[PDB]
Nucleic acid binder design. Sequence first.
RNA 1: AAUAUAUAGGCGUCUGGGGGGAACGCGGGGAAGUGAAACAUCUCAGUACCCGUAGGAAGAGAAAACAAAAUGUGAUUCCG
RNA 2: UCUGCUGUGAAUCUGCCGGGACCACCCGGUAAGCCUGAAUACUUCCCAGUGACCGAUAGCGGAUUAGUACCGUGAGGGAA
RNA 3: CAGCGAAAGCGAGUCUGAAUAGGGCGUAUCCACACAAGAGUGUGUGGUGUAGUGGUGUGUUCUGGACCCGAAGCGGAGUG
RNA 4: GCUGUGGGUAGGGGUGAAAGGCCAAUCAAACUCCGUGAUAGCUGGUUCUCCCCGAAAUGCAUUUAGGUGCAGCGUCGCAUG
RNA 5: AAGUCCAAGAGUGCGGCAGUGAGACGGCGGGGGAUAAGCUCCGUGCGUCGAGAGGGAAACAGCCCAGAUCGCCGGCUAAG
RNA 6: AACACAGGUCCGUGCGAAGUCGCAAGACGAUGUAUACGGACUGACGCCUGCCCGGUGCUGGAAGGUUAAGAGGACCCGUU
RNA 7: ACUACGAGUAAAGAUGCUCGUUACGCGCGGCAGGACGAAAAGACCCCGGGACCUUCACUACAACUUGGUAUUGGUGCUCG
RNA 8: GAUCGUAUUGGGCCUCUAACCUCGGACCGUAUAUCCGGUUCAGGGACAGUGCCUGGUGGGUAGUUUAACUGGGGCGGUUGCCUCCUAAAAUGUAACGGAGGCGCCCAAAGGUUCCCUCAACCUGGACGGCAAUCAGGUGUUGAGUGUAAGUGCACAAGGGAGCUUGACUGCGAGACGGACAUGUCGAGCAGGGACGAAAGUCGGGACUAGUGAUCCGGCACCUCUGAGUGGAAGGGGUGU
Lengths: 96, 79, 63, 49
Amino acid sequence: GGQMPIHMRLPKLKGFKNRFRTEYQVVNVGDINKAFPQGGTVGVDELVAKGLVRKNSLVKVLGDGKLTVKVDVTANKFSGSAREAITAAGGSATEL
Amino acid sequence: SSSRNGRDSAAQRLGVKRFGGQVVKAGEILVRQRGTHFHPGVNVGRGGDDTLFALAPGAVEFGAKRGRKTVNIVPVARP
Amino acid sequence: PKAKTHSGASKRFRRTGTGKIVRQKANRRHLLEHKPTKRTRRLDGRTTVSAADNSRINKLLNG
Amino acid sequence: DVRPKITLACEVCKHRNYITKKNRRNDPDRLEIKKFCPNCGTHQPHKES
RNA sequence: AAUAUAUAGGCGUCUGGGGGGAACGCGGGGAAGUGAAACAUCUCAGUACCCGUAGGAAGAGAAAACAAAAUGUGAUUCCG
RNA sequence: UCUGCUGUGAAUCUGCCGGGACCACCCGGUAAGCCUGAAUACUUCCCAGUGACCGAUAGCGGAUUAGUACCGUGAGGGAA
RNA sequence: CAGCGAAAGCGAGUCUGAAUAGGGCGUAUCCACACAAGAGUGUGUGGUGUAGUGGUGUGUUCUGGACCCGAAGCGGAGUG
RNA sequence: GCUGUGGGUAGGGGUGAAAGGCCAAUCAAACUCCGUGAUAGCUGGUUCUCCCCGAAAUGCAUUUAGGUGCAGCGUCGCAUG
RNA sequence: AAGUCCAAGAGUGCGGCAGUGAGACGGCGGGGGAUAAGCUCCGUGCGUCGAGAGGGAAACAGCCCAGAUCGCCGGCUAAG
RNA sequence: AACACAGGUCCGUGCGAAGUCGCAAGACGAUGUAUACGGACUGACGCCUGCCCGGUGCUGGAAGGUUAAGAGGACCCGUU
RNA sequence: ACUACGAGUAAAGAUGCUCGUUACGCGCGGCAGGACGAAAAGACCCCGGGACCUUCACUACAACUUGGUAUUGGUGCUCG
RNA sequence: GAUCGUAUUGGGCCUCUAACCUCGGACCGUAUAUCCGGUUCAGGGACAGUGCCUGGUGGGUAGUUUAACUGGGGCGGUUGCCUCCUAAAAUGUAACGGAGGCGCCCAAAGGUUCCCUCAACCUGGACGGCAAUCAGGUGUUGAGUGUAAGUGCACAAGGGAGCUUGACUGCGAGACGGACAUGUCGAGCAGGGACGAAAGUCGGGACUAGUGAUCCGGCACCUCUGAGUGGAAGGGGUGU
Ligand SMILES: [Mg+2]
Ligand SMILES: [Mg+2]
Ligand SMILES: [Zn+2]
């Protein structure tokens, strides 16, 4: 109507974008537990086979659920909780 | 053929907000006022610009004390 | 033709993990000396866009 | 201007912590005042910049 | 020739050109109404129009290129 | 990074140019010479077809004397 | 299909902050049970478990002449 | 001085013993085609039926006041009763 | 605390789609005006017209009675 | 009663002049040359045309103040 | 359309509404009081948009002009 | 710190001719040529003209702007914020209705601890008088509160003295008010302080005006980023 519009009378959101950001596709230990009842080696290939992460992305594993199986996980990155939860069930958190 | 008047300020919406018997939480504004037309009673504080606010949960009760109008909060009991 | 997002709206508003639209508060860039710290502290951070502006803000953000 | 804007800095770490106003005609000198300085973590003397 | 070297110029003979064409190409010049609820930056828009030139297509094309530590791609053009 | 005009104005490979001011190191390439098909764009014109396209106030301005009759000095407008 | 943060980053948490100290955002949602509090309820254990995406009808909307009709006037190139 | 025949000056330009006069019955900037289906907060128009519900002419802001944004008031869907 | 409660077709929250944003008169409380205007500016779980037909006021949007689903050559009433 | 006019005054112009039409070449001025040409105001003729150079123009002069590009590269910073 | 008058009422100047008054049907020649008669989407006034004109409004441009540098050279004095 | 020869380098001056110029003369292309070009004589001459950079004058030309409210428009007046009345005893409420104020000030006129009570009048007192300073009495609010008006304040928020910087940093349950953007109050927690024996009070001033969104940019600091890499430039965050 003529007054200063809502998008012009408020401050712009602070910050910048950092185009060199490394973004990861994340998978939780609960999903791994559900999808791998028999355990076994777990890499990015089978993580995309069971439809858990995108095809050709970077995978980081997060420790949300509960892990109760012996599993040998390989991934780009691991969180502290996920690594501890994998190790406690007698598995190896191999980092690429 | 002109007047020197015609300008005024905005209304400040003062007055009693919670009347006697109403249940309030701690910190609710009970009355907005300029002076101390009402003085704080038990469990009622006085703001910088002279608004009275509850200091504890309960039921508002007005009263008098030595000729002074006061606002108090009555400690409603457990259900 | 694709629909173009409003540049100012994109720069002013963001969304949360559930869909709340979030803005910043005004009266903070300058003339800060006579503003008390209590008033300065309520003017930072983020707040949810009020229900009146939700529709127009969503329109500007999407297209 | 008579009452300009002055900025007070901690004497130790020289951080501009506070901005205030003073009458320059009444107070031609720099303002000595003890104020809380955050990074120092304690009350340090402040001087007008 | 003026003027000497000569040159301009003159004379004779052979070979070409000139103009047209609906669209498409390349290279140049280049608006305003309009929008911005006014307007000049900006937009419209390198659009309308105009100029020179082609060809059956044209232009570009064979790294003084990308890329980013991968013992990686490898001219141009066009499409998503 | 590319490029127009005006000045100034280098070296020939431990040289020079690019890796978004700049400097160092590593990487890539080898400017100031020239040619090149296909993938792509278009239909004045010719042939063969198609239509949950029009059926004479529609469809081309024009199914009939059609850029005709008529209008305008002219560019031009333009039917039934 | 993970979020929080200006970002580095961390991640069912995260940011601010000296703070296990409050707050912001988030962990679909419900049920039962304990521990605390009646400053409005919170925190923990179990379960049940999380719904999107691609066609297409409809209503609005964006970019296009955009429901249809209508100026005075403004530019480019030409005719008098 | 009038006049015949022939010729010249062209649009932000000409010509004018000056009136804002004349430049093909229009001139405070000709005419034609094109940009172009210019733009218009303004005027006008917008075509068959029935059933259910049913307003506003207020507040704030506005280069705003005969326009518009948000709110108020209508309707439809869902949730709460 | 009850009432209405096979309804007000009530409130509140979110969402799709709106129109409106020129009001008028009458009754009460007021401002401006001359305590003039069919004047002008406000308040009103005030009304009607707007968007409302029927009866009365001779005619007569805003006053009084009364809210038209349709038919009947039945009855009782309102204002008058 | 407006324009013109013969007459007046001022200003400009030393000659492919000043002025003007043209991007330029070129043209008119003028096949003229200050007794000529252009611009401005006044308007036959008679008697006359007073005071003000502060404002704003036009003409002339640079002793100062201010002032672009270009010349100059003190000092500082980045790189190692 | 088989288009009276009066006093009223109404968007406040009624052939068309109310109450009354008057008037047989249809033509011909005449007059101009009404049909807010016909014609021209009021030129006055206001609001919105143009256009053209003015200036010590703003921003630009032609034109005129200042200096530096290129085209651009030599010998002599003289200053730094 | 002043003078001379070797060198470069610029400024100023007077010349010279060979760039360049001449709508000055004469010859040729040429039979016809007041064009044009060439040859040569006569003059200017490194100036002028022209290109690029640059400062001025510039309604000569062009695109435009030149507010709204308003008992029609114009002229006059006004436009934001605070206080009172209108305003109809909650809140809110219009007019070119009725009256005022603001765009600051205070380093104490802020924080805290402690003490005090005015104005007015009567009487007595050297200048001294209605009213200066002193004394006694009556005096409950009529004085005063930095500044308008209202609501307050004598329990003092009014007067005085000591110490002092809370006119803090990180926050903030819950609210008021609201179209939105603004705006307002706030107990309480931690740090580090002031005053106080302690309880406790202190995030400016008795309260409500004393102000300006966004964009763009400046400065200081930060354990953010850094276009191959190490830096850097630039960009972010916090305060302003
Ligand atoms: Mg003078
Ligand atoms: Mg005033
Ligand atoms: Zn310090």
